[PDB]
Design a protein around this ligand. Sequence first.
Ligand SMILES: N[C@@H](CCCC[NH3+])C(=O)O
Ligand SMILES: N[C@@H](CCCC[NH3+])C(=O)O
Ligand SMILES: [Fe+3]
Length: 343
Amino acid sequence: LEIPTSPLIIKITQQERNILSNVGNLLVKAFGNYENPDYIASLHLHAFQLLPERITRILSQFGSDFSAEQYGAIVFQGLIEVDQDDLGPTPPNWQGADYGKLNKYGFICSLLHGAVPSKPVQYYAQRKGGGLLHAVIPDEKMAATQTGSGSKTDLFVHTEDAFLSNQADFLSFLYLRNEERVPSTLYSIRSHGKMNPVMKKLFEPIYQCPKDSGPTASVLYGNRELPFIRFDAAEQIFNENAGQTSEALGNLMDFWDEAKTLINSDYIPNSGDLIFVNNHLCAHGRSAFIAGQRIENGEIIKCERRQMLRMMSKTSLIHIRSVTRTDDPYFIMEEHLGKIFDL
Ligand SMILES: N[C@@H](CCCC[NH3+])C(=O)O
Ligand SMILES: N[C@@H](CCCC[NH3+])C(=O)O
Ligand SMILES: [Fe+3]
C-alpha cells in the first residue's frame, strides 16, 4: 500500500484556462448568475459538456474514490488567471465583497462540483446561508478568532461543519490572492494507513461536536477498514467548554497525537489555485499570519489582504430532504447533529 501523504497536484494548462474563461463568460451571458434555478437544474449537463475533458475525468474519478490510496484533496494549480488590478483592493470584511465581480468564478466553481457529480448547497449555520459562493476575507475586528474571518490561527485542522449530520460532501477553495503566502494545511484520514487501535475507538458515538448536554457522534464512520471522518481539533479538543467525557477526551488526544504528525503544510497557494476536497476524507486548516503583509530577508512587505472563495456541495438532495427548506432543497436548515434551527 502506498499511503497518501500529500494531495494530487494538477497543473492546469493555458488552453484549459482559456476554455474555463470562455465557458464562464458564456454562462454569465446565458444565465445571468450561478444561482439561476434553470442553471442549477441543468448543472451536471453544463459541467460534463463545458469543462475541459481532463478536469471532468479527474473529478468523476475523485467523486467515487474512497480507496486506501486516495488522499481526498486535489490542488488545481493555475485554474484561473486573476487580474489583480481589476480585482482591486480586498474589502474590509466578507459583507463588502462585490458579487457581480465573483459571478464568473461562481460559475467555474459550480461546474467543478457538478462534474463530481455534486450539488452546490448553502447552510443556515454559515452566514444564514449567504449564497452558494462565500468570500473568505480576514477581518481586523476578528483578527485572532477561530473562524474564516480570522488571521492568527495555527497548527489545527478541521473537516467543514463537524457539528452537522449533513455536513458538505465536497468543498472547493478558490484563492484569488495569498500575497501573505499563508500555507494551506491539509490532513487526510488515509495518511494513517491501516486501521489501528487508536483509530478504532473513534467509531464509538461518544464524542461532542460543538456548534461553530449536547448530542454525541462518532469521529469515524462509513467503512470499518477505510473510514470517513468528522473532526475539529480546536472545537472538540482544545475547547475548555467542549464537554467531552474523560474517556472521549483521552481517545481524541491519542488520535490528535498520531494525526498532528501527518498534517501537510507544504502547499502555499498562488492566486488562481483551487483546492478541491472530499470533506469526508480530508480536514483543512490555515497557519497563523498578519493580514496584508509578508516577511522577506528580515523586512516587512505590505500587500493586499488574503481573498479566497468557498463553495460546498452534497451528492444527494434526497437524503438531506428532512433538513432543507420546503421551497429550496439546496438550503440546509440543520443546526446541530440532527436538530433544525427553530426560527
Ligand atoms: N468566514 C466564514 C468561515 C467559517 C468556517 C470555518 N471555521 C464564516 O464566517 O462563516
Ligand atoms: N478558510 C481559511 C483559509 C483556507 C485554508 C484551507 N486549507 C481562512 O480562515 O481564511
Ligand atoms: Fe473550514
